[PDB]
Design a protein around this motif. Structure first.
Motif, PDB file in Angstrom:
ATOM      1  N   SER A  16       0.829  -1.194   0.000  1.00 43.00           N
ATOM      2  CA  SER A  16       0.000   0.000   0.000  1.00 43.00           C
ATOM      3  C   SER A  16       0.872   1.255   0.000  1.00 43.00           C
ATOM      4  O   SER A  16       2.089   1.205   0.192  1.00 43.00           O
ATOM      5  CB  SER A  16      -0.937   0.002   1.208  1.00 43.00           C
ATOM      6  N   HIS A  17       0.226   2.398  -0.220  1.00 45.82           N
ATOM      7  CA  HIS A  17       0.899   3.688  -0.284  1.00 45.82           C
ATOM      8  C   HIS A  17       0.220   4.660   0.672  1.00 45.82           C
ATOM      9  O   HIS A  17      -0.782   4.338   1.316  1.00 45.82           O
ATOM     10  CB  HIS A  17       0.892   4.246  -1.713  1.00 45.82           C
ATOM     11  N   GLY A  18       0.779   5.865   0.760  1.00 43.60           N
ATOM     12  CA  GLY A  18       0.191   6.920   1.560  1.00 43.60           C
ATOM     13  C   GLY A  18       0.166   6.676   3.051  1.00 43.60           C
ATOM     14  O   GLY A  18      -0.498   7.425   3.772  1.00 43.60           O
ATOM     15  N   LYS A  19       0.866   5.657   3.538  1.00 43.14           N
ATOM     16  CA  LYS A  19       0.903   5.334   4.958  1.00 43.14           C
ATOM     17  C   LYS A  19       2.280   5.690   5.504  1.00 43.14           C
ATOM     18  O   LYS A  19       3.288   5.115   5.077  1.00 43.14           O
ATOM     19  CB  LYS A  19       0.588   3.857   5.192  1.00 43.14           C
ATOM     20  N   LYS A  20       2.316   6.627   6.440  1.00 44.90           N
ATOM     21  CA  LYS A  20       3.545   7.127   7.028  1.00 44.90           C
ATOM     22  C   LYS A  20       3.700   6.645   8.461  1.00 44.90           C
ATOM     23  O   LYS A  20       2.711   6.351   9.143  1.00 44.90           O
ATOM     24  CB  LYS A  20       3.565   8.661   7.010  1.00 44.90           C
ATOM     25  N   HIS A  58       4.679  12.097  10.477  1.00 50.65           N
ATOM     26  CA  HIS A  58       3.372  12.728  10.380  1.00 50.65           C
ATOM     27  C   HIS A  58       3.490  14.238  10.533  1.00 50.65           C
ATOM     28  O   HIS A  58       4.395  14.749  11.200  1.00 50.65           O
ATOM     29  CB  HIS A  58       2.424  12.175  11.444  1.00 50.65           C
TER      30      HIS A  58
END
Length: 49
Positions: A33-37, A42
């Motif tokens: 997946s993407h967009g997960k920090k 943050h």
RNA sequence: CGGGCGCAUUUCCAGGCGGUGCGCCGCGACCGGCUCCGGGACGGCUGGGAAGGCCCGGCGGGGAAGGUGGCUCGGGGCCCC
């Protein structure tokens, strides 16, 4: 990696050798997946008050 | 079987890399769905309708009416305002 020895010339050394024990029915991999920090990356928000 | 120890393997101790975590919780940013709030600009009408803001010269009629005019009440000094 090649290092000297005592007798028999020099023998090549293999770094990161093969593992010795394999657990059966290992878990497959994620779907990437993407967009997960992480929490350290943050953006920090603050209220105007 | 044999020739052979920076090499390879067996155990313990202390750390990092990717998969897993007694019970009770909390936090963060992204994704989907949904409700609600605030802000700012744009088009059309009868190229919106009606008010506002200064007045010049001027027309009309009319009423939910300034003075004039019997009467009523009150105030101040028969009378007067």
């Amino acid at each position: 990696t090649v290092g000297g020895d005592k007798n028999g010339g020099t023998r090549v050394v293999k770094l990161r050798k093969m593992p010795r024990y394999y657990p059966t029915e290992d878990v497959p991999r994620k779907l990437l997946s993407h967009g997960k920090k992480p929490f350290s990356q943050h953006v920090r928000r603050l209220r105007s008050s």
